Amino acid sequence: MIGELVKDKILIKNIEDARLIYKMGYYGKPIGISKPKSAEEINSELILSLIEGVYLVKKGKLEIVSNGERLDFERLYQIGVTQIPRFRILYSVYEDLREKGYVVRSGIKYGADFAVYTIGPGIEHAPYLVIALDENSQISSNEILGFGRVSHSTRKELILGIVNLTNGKIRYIMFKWLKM
Amino acid sequence: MIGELVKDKILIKNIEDARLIYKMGYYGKPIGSELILSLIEGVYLVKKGKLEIVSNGERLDFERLYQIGVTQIPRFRILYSVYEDLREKGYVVRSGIKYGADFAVYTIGPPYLVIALDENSQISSNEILGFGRVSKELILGIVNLTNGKIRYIMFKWLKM
Ligand SMILES: [Cl-]
Ligand SMILES: [Cl-]
């Protein structure tokens, strides 16, 4: 498994490698398709985000190169910090959730950071929406109101992933828009 | 029902009146007896026509009492908005300070802790899960000072 760093994303040019990385656990998105039922229908280069790439590298399931240079975890992580806003808190939740066995996808279509899934041999579940947060970052009422808006929009489960960048621990707090 | 304004609180000197106001729906706290009502409770009861208030001769109506609340009590506007809305919805609303919140709401349907907030407020992620009773639930009372509408959002400390 080898991938090319191109800006803020990682390109998987080999289709076999692509289909394999995707089979592993629904990583990346193929170019031109939105979301493949199976890796079987993937025929275009697999595109991985830095968050996904950095995870896979750390998992030893992927090597990354940037025009000759071989970027390891320390370097890739650092690039994520520079390129991607909120990279630290986003990777912390991505990793933690991924490490716990959930299948983590982008949650932007739903107005959140991630779309977390519980899957297994012949088992698919509804997507939990997670929004990563820096425990200290001050949230406004307008943002908090924006939260409870994305929640009862696709009426799924909205969840805040509060990360401590020091100890790396994570506190998950879910909230619903109530109708007192 | 007549009550005296004494600073930021309202005194109910008559014990019958006291016991009645308390029977109504658990309003005020006795000094255990004179029933002591907070401006938030007093202003509500006045508006409900269930209580008259006096301040050394002067008869204070809703407009004046409300204004006094604004002057005396910090966050009075957002606190009364949630108090009233919740009370108007039939919940029994008590102080929630013992629990580190504004109110302790009791449902008479099928204590919830609520913290009233203004649309311009800014709470940290660790102020939230921080304290109330979280690390159970804590309900956020988000108030729009313009239209006076209120959005309630509850959140729990999860264990993913
Ligand atoms: Cl992603
Ligand atoms: Cl009260």
Description:
- Chain A: The active site is at 117, 125, 156.
- Chain A: Its EC number is 4.6.1.16.
- Two copies of one chain form a homodimer.
- The first copy, chain A, is globular.
- With 180 residues, chain A is an alpha+beta fold.
- In chain A, 31% of the residues lie in helices and 31% in strands.
- The interface between A and B is medium-sized, with 31 and 31 residues.
- Bound molecules: chloride ion (2 copies).
- One chloride ion binds at residues 49, 51-52, 106 of chain A.
Ligands bound here?
chloride ion
How do the SSEs of chain A run, as a string of H and E? EEHEEHEEHHEEEEHEE
Categorize the overall geometry of chain A.
Answer: globular
Q: Mind telling me the C-alpha Rg of chain A?
A: 17 Å
The most extensive interface, with participating residues per chain, is:
A-B, 31 and 31 residues
PDB class: hydrolase
Keywords: tRNA-intron endonuclease, tRNA splicing, Structural Genomics, nppsfa, National Project on Protein Structural and Functional Analyses, RIKEN Structural Genomics/Proteomics Initiative, rsgi, hydrolase
Assembly: dimeric
Entry title: Crystal structure of tRNA-intron endonuclease from Sulfolobus tokodaii
